[PDB]
Ligand binder design. Structure first.
Ligand SMILES: OC[C@H]1O[C@H](O[C@@H]2[C@H](O)[C@@H](O)O[C@H](CO)[C@H]2O)[C@@H](O)[C@@H](O)[C@@H]1O
Ligand SMILES: [Cl-]
Ligand SMILES: [Cl-]
Length: 138
């Protein structure tokens, strides 16, 4: 078995969410992160050609980045307090896809098993992103 899970990074507020079902749509191809002055407000991930249902709140500006064909996320770092503040998605093409504010408790998630990549995310949300989890697999 090659699946592994990193998290949760954040606190216990909000309601749990998961993109477990979304991996049937395809590999991660794009990221949407709504950000304000202090926090990561919301998250959306594109699996193959299909965007997940938006999670989080509305009080922030939407940032968006598409992955290149064949580009996979192989490491995720970030920062949090009671809520998520920063995410950096490191890819196998050497890109560091950064969102949010450089402050708070830091974390650094890497996959446990050989040759695995980021397949989906989970976490907790409300008006903000309270917590995030990273799920790795072949
Ligand atoms: O995700 C953050 C937070 O969202 C919800 O609470 C909101 C916040 O406390 C704040 O923005 O004020 C709102 C109205 O006063 C309030 O709804 C909850 O889902 C909470 O559990 C969660 O931590
Ligand atoms: Cl850590
Ligand atoms: Cl760290």
């Amino acid at each position: 078995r090659s699946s592994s899970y990193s998290g949760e990074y954040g606190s216990g507020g909000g309601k749990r969410f998961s993109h477990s079902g979304n991996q049937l749509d395809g590999p991660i191809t794009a990221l949407r992160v709504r950000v304000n002055t202090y926090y990561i407000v919301g998250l959306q991930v594109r699996y193959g050609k299909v965007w997940s249902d938006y999670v989080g709140g509305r009080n922030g500006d939407l940032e968006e980045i598409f992955l290149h064909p064949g580009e996979s996320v192989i490491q995720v770092s970030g920062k949090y307090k009671w809520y998520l503040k920063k995410l950096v998605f490191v890819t196998d093409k050497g890109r560091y896809l950064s969102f949010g504010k450089d402050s708070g408790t830091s974390f650094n998630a890497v996959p446990l098993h050989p040759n695995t990549v980021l397949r989906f995310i989970s976490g907790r949300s409300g008006s903000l992103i309270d917590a995030i989890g990273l799920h790795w697999d072949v």
